[PDB]
Design a protein around this ligand. Structure first.
Ligand SMILES: OC[C@H]1O[C@H](OC[C@H]2O[C@@H](O)[C@@H](O)[C@@H](O)[C@@H]2O)[C@H](O)[C@@H](O)[C@H]1O
Ligand SMILES: [Ca+2]
Length: 139
């Protein structure tokens, strides 16, 4: 299934205002990463757009090099409300992701979502180098 496109959404700003914003997780470079402005609460994802819903069949991600531990416990969610109050967890990261590569995980949830995100665990500053969603328009 193809890589899904959308509008990047999530935590605004970056650590020490250096500029490593959420957009660095979608730029195709595994060397660039999102470094959030706070230790906790950081998240990033996509809005596929009004009236657009995709079924998610796979997620790929790559940790920030040297900070792979900061992804453990992170979750990926799908939702149809931008505040994620109706979210369901699509996958939970429970082991250390390999450095410098995209780890691919299958998703088995038939629901169509307008919104998807990665919700980072405490102490991570949202650290992630790259994030990709795959799937198909909801029937
Ligand atoms: O705390 C978030 C922060 O963690 C690392 O930096 C930790 C500290 O490193 C030190 O060398 C000092 O620069 C100190 O100011 C830092 O808090 C990451 O390298 C950084 O990007 C950021 O994620
Ligand atoms: Ca990147």
């Amino acid at each position: 299934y193809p890589k899904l496109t959308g509008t990047v959404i999530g935590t605004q700003g970056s650590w020490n205002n250096i500029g490593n914003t959420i957009h660095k997780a979608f730029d195709g470079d595994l060397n660039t990463f999102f470094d959030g402005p706070t230790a906790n609460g950081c998240w990033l994802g996509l809005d596929f757009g009004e009236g657009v819903r995709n079924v998610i069949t796979q997620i790929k991600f790559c940790p920030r090099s040297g900070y792979e531990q900061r992804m453990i416990g992170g979750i990926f969610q799908g939702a149809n409300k931008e505040d994620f109050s109706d979210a369901v967890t699509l996958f939970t990261i429970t082991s250390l992701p390999g450095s410098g590569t995209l780890t691919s995980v299958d998703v088995d949830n038939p629901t169509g979502f307008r919104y998807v995100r990665y919700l980072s665990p405490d102490g991570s500053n949202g650290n992630i180098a790259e994030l990709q969603f795959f799937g198909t328009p909801a029937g």
